[PDB]
């Protein structure tokens, strides 16, 4: 089916998380769940994504998939042109929907393979390590935001380290961080959540 | 074909990088390139991997793939039992090799889908952030090792940050780090490669 | 097949590890993988091993296996003499190879049962607890050697204890141990690998 | 024939020298020596190179070469579609190998023309002017490396100038450069090779 | 067609830039655009160029092109003598114009291949690094001249470096350079264009 | 008709003004006035412009225009392939000129729609806010240049503001600006044109 | 037969020794040992050598050898055109191999005569008299290198003279030469080999 808003949302996450974050490809493959055409899949993506990424993925589609077609006719499928074009001649919606289910397996695998291929820019997440917690904002909630998105981008929650500790420290508001740095070194989450829980 | 050593190597990388590092799944899908049986694929993996991971992936194989079979017979493939068991009745090597190429697409997609599913433990890389550069070891080569594997695990080379700077610092030998910390703060790779290039 | 060198190697390990170390019986059963004659198995072992061990195992073979034959003819196998002698009358290589596969199961089980029976001397590993690390030798590599072989003999890596700590200590070179004992008590592997990493 | 490693090597040189260094195009035209298909030539290059470069060169291939086809049919060749597509309809390996030798001349000229067209990024060589000679590394060998690669990139050995002299100076180790700068100004290669030839 | 003046101009650029500067071969291949005879091409070049270069290129023409003819008759072109002489027997203008278009591809490729081969002297550009800006001449325009021609010869605009900075410095008039050297070190183009913009 | 020089000129303005300045699209649509082929329009633009921009615009041409073709055949035009390819099969110049005038309306609208789509880099005008008036150059003429081009890029003459006042100030020569800043704050164009009108 | 590497090696020696050193012509005549075509001999040499040398030798070949042909037909050989062209009409490999053995004598003599004719530049050996022994390098081995190559170029080992003595002296490292010059004048090889045999 046509996913509209969640597509927009993953595009937003793609610009913040990058088309490499376990998040993004997880959602990719999640949407790939449905028997549907790569044609509109890719029109959709080039709508959210930017052109050359798209057309490159689809050109490598043509190349590798028609090599697969070589193999398929070595095995003798008798296919690979029309659907395995994205749209060959009359793939107008349903005429493309005429997929073989194993042909659907092929097309879905190829689309996700493509999407898997091309590299992201390489720097959409800097915000994570960046400025701080907002001063008025609650601290532990900010830290929770931090570790959750750090798992999102780093790929695991188990990135937490004195690196992450001083990341939160610098990111804490001047009040809370100014309490923590004189508080102790080797200070753990319990100390922070204990201390800075007020407004004043 | 039977990949032996590189399989061993990815298993080693899986215990160090984890079955989440872009490295590991990249190699997974790279090996998935060949028309072959998921049966020996999975026997291989359960040989390198540990059992429950394997049999769980293959049970979810059965479940989701026989739902796919529901759909396939809604479309009317007339298949999904024998090959889409891993081995149904007489999948003895070649009799399994009797795959439909679209059936191969399905099985490869399902295997990689499974492997994609289950979570790693969550902490095979601690060594990265860990002890140091060896004292006798050359420093810049160590740093190169660091950023390369940091890209391996973090998923991008663009993790480098004053975090990574003090990571190298602590990791540098007492000589080089003892030169760098008095040297300057805000010190970049050029400074390190400049300074500590000797033996004495 | 004829394993030559690895047999020699396990014999070496048997004199150092003893025919009790999980290592040795693991390799025993690993070699037992093949449909082959206990005859040459045992000629091989008595070649590496020493006679009375061998002939005793094979005498208990005769005894328990011919009791098994009692049972087999209670069930009525109609066998147990020729092959279940090791060589009865014309077991000359292939004529012995005429094994029943369930007969092979029996013979392999009996051979490994025998090998399992007789006791080792009781002291081939003293070297482990013994003299030291060589002075010029690297320390942490020595310690790694220590814990690996300690797992080999003790049967688990989880023998490591302040016992093992002072074992390494005494075993460390006079330099490193003379650094460690004044360094601290309750000192862990991190401390050792940290300190003694040099040559001078 | 299939050049594998040297292709990898020129790709490495392309990232260091750039697809403009006399080196790179010299090797390009050197490989172009053989009667072979631009199809796999270009698949190869897009394998080493990055996509848009490739497909752009091949699109301009289509454009200019089909203008050439205009001319060819003004002269009346009766060709330019199938081979002069890269693969028109059945250029499957040998069916493409069905080239006319003058048609091969055309295709080789067109491929090299394309490759000649598109511009490099513009900065893969900075290393040349960059950090230094390694301190332990021998100096004159480093200088030799310098002038050789300077010829590689600049296109001639006759770039050597007091620019290059102070380039080597800065690049020399602190020992050798600290000897040379007090040594003299207007110092030539003979002076450097004379002075810094030791270890200490 | 007969290019007269631009040929003269590239010859001038060849004596200043050398028959290696991306400029010169770019113009070479640009003129090669037309279906025409290598005969007058080469008469033209030996008119601008100097003899041995020419006749050497054309001798290697004969050699490599008649090896190509070997191959062509292995493929069976049935040609290579008359046109693939430059003029065999009756190549008098139009009778040479009787080229096959694939034969034209061959001849153009061969001519440009030749021209590509032979080496320049090795030092036509010294003027670039040389004397200075004229004193009365405007400085920034001179610098623009510098970087443009430096791109011409070096092959890229990205040669600009403190080398090029002191090149302009020395090249600046005594007034402007005498202002700049006391002005600052690490001075960029903005500083120069800012300062020396006057006459007095 | 073939516009040559003005095309070059708009390309120059595109690199200085950007393909967003009201100037550039005004000229675009001005040239679009003529019944002509998008084919050569786009060959022209990709000649001045850079490839991916072009081919992207034309790919979106294919996509949206063949959706328009969907609609056209819902209305039943019976067209959209050959001309609405840019060149389908025999669009060789006149055979493309066989456009329907409403088909020309479509193609012109599509071409300008494309050109309208893709984004400029985002920074070709910095010169505007940049260095200054040349010292010898007349001031008010420079200011006139400023406001005219500021209208060109900003899209209106009504950008003039104390921002623009200090822009001219900084841009004025040291003489004139050094007269104006002590002259007054809130100084208008009349003051500047009054004061700095001399040479000395 | 095709000598590849040794040809490369003599070319290297030709650039260092010059095509006059007894070495080079000795190797020339050594290779001339085989009944083979001067055609590929000369293609080979012009591959290692540089063109005008080659074609000049072969032009004088034509001249003197066709004078020899004058004489041959005064004696009435009835030959000298085809083979005594290098390749007359159908000297394609074997058809050239159709040499008369006395004709081979003629062609070999002519080729070596040519090669004997033309003069070397006149200065490829300066290195010999040049910089020094490397400081770390062993001295007597360096001296051995010296006299061996001095025999190579000078044509005899009996060049050794107080000239050669001070050549080695200057060439000795500062240590050894600084020992020798105060050691004695009229010092012979025995003194040097005696003294400087150490490292320190």
Describe the structure.
The structure is cut from a larger assembly and holds 7 copies of chain A (200 residues). With 200 residues, the first copy, chain A, is mostly helical. Helices cover 60% and strands 0% of the residues of chain A. Chain A is built from 10 helices and no strands. In chain A, helix 3 runs antiparallel to helix 4, helix 4 packs across helix 6 and helix 8 crosses helix 9. The radius of gyration of chain A is 23 Å and the shape is elongated. Chains in contact: A-B, A-D, A-F, B-C, B-D, D-E, D-F, D-G, E-F, E-G. Chains A, B, C, D, E, F, G: It is found in: Virion. Chains A, B, C, D, E, F, G: Capsid protein. Chains A, B, C, D, E, F, G: This is Capsid protein p27.
User: Major sheet of chain A: size, sense and barrel closure?
Assistant: none
Oligomer: part of a larger assembly
* Largest protein interface, residues of each chain: A-B, 33 and 33 residues
Helix content of chain A: 55-70%
General shape of chain A: elongated
* Class per helix and strand makeup of chain A: mainly alpha
């Amino acid at each position: 089916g046509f996913d509209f808003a969640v597509i927009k949302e993953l595009k937003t996450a793609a610009s913040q998380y990058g088309a490499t974050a376990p998040y993004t490809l997880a959602i990719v493959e999640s949407v790939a769940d449905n028997w549907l055409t790569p044609t509109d899949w890719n029109t959709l993506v080039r709508a959210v994504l930017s052109g050359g990424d798209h057309l490159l993925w689809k050109s490598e589609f043509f190349e590798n998939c028609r090599d697969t077609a070589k193999r398929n006719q070595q095995a003798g499928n008798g296919w690979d042109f029309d659907m395995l074009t994205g749209s060959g001649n009359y793939s107008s919606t349903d005429a493309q929907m005429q997929y073989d289910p194993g042909l659907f397996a092929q097309i879905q695998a190829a689309a996700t393979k493509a999407w898997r291929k091309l590299p992201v820019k390489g720097d959409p997440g800097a915000s994570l390590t960046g400025v701080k917690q907002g001063p008025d904002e609650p601290f532990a909630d900010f830290v929770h935001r931090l570790i959750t998105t750090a798992g999102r981008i780093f790929g695991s929650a188990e990135a937490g380290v004195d690196y992450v500790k001083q990341l939160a420290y610098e990111n804490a508001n001047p009040a809370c961080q100014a309490a923590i740095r004189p508080y102790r070194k080797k200070t753990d989450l319990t100390g922070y959540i204990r201390l800075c829980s007020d407004i004043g």
